[PDB]
């Protein structure tokens, strides 16, 4: 955590609903955006830390 690793996400699509539809993840949270809305959205970049 003192050396956190960042992917930069661009020029692509993904099913962001899988992040909470899959039981593989013990918690999911969202801020500004709503978790059910994510598949309708578009962005210039996303940073995956």
């Amino acid at each position: 955590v003192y050396a956190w690793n960042r992917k930069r996400i661009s020029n692509c699509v993904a099913d962001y609903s899988v992040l909470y539809n899959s039981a593989s993840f013990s918690t999911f949270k969202c801020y500004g955006v709503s978790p059910t809305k994510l598949n309708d959205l578009c962005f210039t970049n996303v940073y995956a830390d």
């Binding site: 609903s17 909470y20 539809n21 899959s22 039981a23 978790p35 059910t36």
Partner: protein, 48 residues
């Protein structure tokens, strides 16, 4: 804590529609069954 609001509903209210229901709201891939994962109690307190 005696002041509260509805955090979740299936759809938006019509004008002057009123709704006191406390049933557990389900978002997706797991049912509520009176509980959680993808399921939520529909009210919250302000707790002033």
């Amino acid at each position: 804590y005696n002041y509260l609001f509805r955090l979740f509903r299936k759809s938006n209210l019509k004008p002057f529609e009123r709704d006191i229901s406390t049933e557990i709201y389900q978002a997706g891939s797991t049912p509520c069954n009176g509980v959680g994962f993808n399921c939520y109690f529909p009210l919250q307190s302000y707790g002033f």
